[PDB]
């Protein structure tokens, strides 16, 4: 839904990255994958504990 809304409106949205960090993300995946996002707005989507 986000990708459809972004690529269809008129304002002009520059969506930088889409990250899907799976597994228990103990220390490896989280740290190696979260270091690229250095934009100004982050749109989280997860359960409470995650």
């Amino acid at each position: 839904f986000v990708k459809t809304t972004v690529d269809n409106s008129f304002v002009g949205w520059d969506m930088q990255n889409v990250i899907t960090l799976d597994t228990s993300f103990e220390d490896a995946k989280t740290q190696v994958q979260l270091k690229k996002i250095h934009s100004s707005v982050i749109l989280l989507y997860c359960s409470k504990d995650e």
Binding site: Q31, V32, K35, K36
Partner: protein, 51 residues
């Protein structure tokens, strides 16, 4: 230097188009190259083996 290069490779600054240059004291003995040194370290040093 080893720590900084290892932390910078994670950030994504060590691709085909990133050139690192370091003085002699970073590579001051040779033949003991660590694991984290990339290929293309343009480093000046005292005469390697001709002297």
């Amino acid at each position: 230097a080893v720590l900084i290069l290892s932390e910078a490779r994670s950030l994504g600054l060590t691709g085909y188009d990133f050139f690192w240059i370091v003085p002699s004291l970073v590579s001051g003995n040779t033949e003991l190259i660590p694991k984290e040194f990339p290929s293309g370290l343009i480093s000046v040093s005292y005469d390697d083996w001709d002297y």
